[PDB]
């Protein structure tokens, strides 16, 4: 005979944005109505001190600058797929036999496992996109040291 020992399913490990150290670099705000808007602007108002000049030299003026900061959009996507077997068995029963029960259990577990994997992948994609937008804007060392 041919002997098959214990079969193993992968013990996939979960990860989250908040649990990662990168979350400390970030501020995270959730907003259920984000789909409707595409503009986010912040404004800064600053008055710069001027030292009173000496005799004869040109004098300074009361001066201010006003500057605005804008938003970057970078949505992320993940696809996941279901076969016809799971889709038809998830909403049907055939004679109520034991094998049909096995198929129903398999279909339900398959779709829910796919949903769980997609959620984990979405969290990974969110942290990935945050790193992308952070790194794409960071200048190198020599320029900042020269500055």
């Amino acid at each position: 005979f041919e002997a098959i020992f214990g079969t193993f399913c992968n013990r996939l490990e979960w990860v989250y944005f908040l649990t990662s150290g990168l979350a400390a670099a970030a501020h995270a705000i959730k907003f259920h109505d984000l789909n409707k808007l595409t503009t986010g602007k912040m404004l800064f108002h600053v008055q710069v001190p001027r030292v009173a000049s000496g005799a004869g030299l040109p004098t300074s003026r009361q001066t201010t600058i006003m500057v605005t900061k804008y938003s970057e959009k970078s949505p992320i996507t993940i696809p996941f797929e279901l076969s016809a077997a799971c889709l038809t068995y998830l909403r049907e029963t055939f004679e109520g036999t034991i094998l049909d029960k096995i198929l129903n259990v398999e279909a339900m577990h398959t779709v829910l496992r796919a949903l769980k994997n997609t959620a984990d992948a979405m969290e990974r994609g969110l942290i990935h996109s945050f790193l992308q937008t952070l790194l794409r804007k960071a200048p190198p060392y020599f320029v900042v040291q020269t500055l």
Partner: protein, 49 residues
């Protein structure tokens, strides 16, 4: 100091594995547990055979 197993482990060939080997020409370890878990509806295995 460390604790170690004092003897060899014994593996038992179940009577259901006998009929599976005779007809199906294969032996599934812990077969009764497999049948019970399959009919129960829990896919995740209890532990390695």
């Amino acid at each position: 100091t460390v604790s170690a197993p004092a003897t060899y482990g014994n593996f038992v060939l179940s009577p259901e594995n006998a009929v599976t080997a005779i007809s199906y020409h294969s032996i599934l370890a812990d077969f009764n547990s497999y049948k019970a878990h399959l009919t129960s509806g829990q896919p995740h295995l209890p532990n390695d055979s």
